Amino acid sequence: STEEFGKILLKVNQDGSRVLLRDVAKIELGGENYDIIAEFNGQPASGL
Amino acid sequence: EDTPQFKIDIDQEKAQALGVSINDINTTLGAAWGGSYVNDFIDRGRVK
Amino acid sequence: GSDLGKKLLEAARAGRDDEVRILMANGADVNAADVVGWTPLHLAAYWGHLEIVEVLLKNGADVNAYDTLGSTPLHLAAHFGHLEIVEVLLKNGADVNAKDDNGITPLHLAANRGHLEIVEVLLKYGADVNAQDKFGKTAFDISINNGNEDLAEILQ
């Protein structure tokens, strides 16, 4: 899940605070690429 | 049927704090307990 | 390792209520365990079988029995989100502040998988909220790292 990727520990600061991956990035379950967007009679669609 | 298995969780913060890389940890565990195919050698004109 | 004891372990795991009832009548060993050290109560708590947990406790099953790594049935019940079993165990005198070999309490495990209702039940029965594991991390330290807003608010 996105939550588990969020709590990936990149490094620990000198004072003690933790820099997580969600502190330096936005993490969502998006598409491999955003090239193709299909529609069937106007409404959202996919296909083969 | 499912069987009891020994789940071990490597603490990332403690590993980064002591200065122990995750590669060295996971290799030491994997190589020792599981085994590791390193490379080939020639035994009486036969690759093994 | 008796004959009926091994059948009670498999029965408690599968969740066959009718077979467990018959084995309790025949006098099956409630304190019997496998190689890792799991009692029928451990297995019943793990797979979330409410009836068998109740039946085993009535037939003098050890509520505070622990495996080879010090984990009690309350750990397994709290970790895998079984609200009913956690209540039944705590009513029958389950150690709420039970530490395993790693110092992980049932509160830590319930906090990690974000079981909000179970955390409230544990805190009600007197769970030490400031209890630290071997790495010096409390149930609050788990909630902020996981990014759970609801859980962090409860652990005030």
Residue type, C111: A
* C-beta separation of C8 from C20 below 8 A: yes
Q: What's the CA angle centered on C92, arms C54 and C103, to 5 degrees?
A: 110
Using DSSP's 3-state secondary structure scheme, residue B24 falls into: helix
Closest-CA residue of C relative to A2 is C146
For the stretch C62-88, what's the b/e string if a residue is b when 16 or more beta carbons lie within 10 angstroms of its beta carbon? Answer: ebebbbeeebbbbbbbbbbbbbebbbb
Cα C57 from Cα C40, distance rounded (Å): 10
Count the Cβ atoms, other than its own, within 10 Å of residue C90.
22
**Does B7 touch chain C if contact means CB atoms closer than 8 Å?**
no
**Does C144 touch chain A if contact means CB atoms closer than 8 Å?**
no
Whose structure tokens read 């319930």?
C110
Residue type, C125: Y
Using DSSP's 3-state secondary structure scheme, residue B38 falls into: coil
* C-beta separation of C80 from C48 below 8 A: yes
Chain B residues in contact with A11 by the CB 8 A cut-off are 16
Cα B31 from Cα C113, distance rounded (Å): 31
Strand partners, A39: A44
**Does A3 touch chain C if contact means CB atoms closer than 8 Å?**
yes
Cβ neighbours for C38, distance < 8 A, ≥ 6 positions apart: B4, C9, C46, C67
Min Cα distance A28 → chain B (Å) is: 23
- Angle at which helix C3-14 crosses helix C17-26, to 10 degrees, equals 160
**CA C55 centroid distance within chain:** 15
Radius of gyration (C-alpha) of chain A in whole angstroms: 18
Ramachandran region, residue C81 (left: φ > 0; alpha: ψ -120 to 50; beta: rest): left
Radius of gyration (C-alpha) of chain C in whole angstroms: 16
* C-beta separation of C135 from C104 below 8 A: no
Q: Report phi then psi at A20, rounded to 5.
A: -85, 170
Min Cα distance A20 → chain C (Å) is: 9
Cα C4 from Cα C82, distance rounded (Å): 27
Q: Report phi then psi at C130, rounded to 5.
A: -95, 10
**Way it was determined:** X-ray
Strand partners, B26: none
Min Cα distance C105 → chain A (Å) is: 21
| Alpha-carbon separation of residue A35 from A38, B40, C97 (angstroms) | 10, 46, 54
Radius of gyration (C-alpha) of chain B in whole angstroms: 17
User: Do residue C135 and residue B4 have CB atoms under 8 angstroms apart?
Assistant: no
Cα C146 from Cα C152, distance rounded (Å): 10
User: Do residue B11 and residue C35 have CB atoms under 8 angstroms apart?
Assistant: no
Ramachandran region, residue B35 (left: φ > 0; alpha: ψ -120 to 50; beta: rest): left
* Domain definitions of chain C by residue range: 1-156
Cβ neighbours for C112, distance < 8 A, ≥ 6 positions apart: C79, C142, C146
Min Cα distance A11 → chain B (Å) is: 7
Cβ neighbours for C147, distance < 8 A, ≥ 6 positions apart: A3, A6, A7, A22
Cβ neighbours for C123, distance < 8 A, ≥ 6 positions apart: C107, C129, C154
User: Do residue B13 and residue C36 have CB atoms under 8 angstroms apart?
Assistant: no
Strand partners, A9: A20
User: Do residue B14 and residue C35 have CB atoms under 8 angstroms apart?
Assistant: no
Per-residue HEC secondary structure of chain C comes to CCHHHHHHHHHHHHCCHHHHHHHHHHCCCCCCCCCCCCCHHHHHHHHCCHHHHHHHHHCCCCCCCCCCCCCCHHHHHHHCCCHHHHHHHHHCCCCCCCCCCCCCCHHHHHHHCCCHHHHHHHHHCCCCCCCCCCCCCCHHHHHHHHCCHHHHHHCC
| Other chains touching B, judged by 3 or more CB pairs under 8 Å | A, C
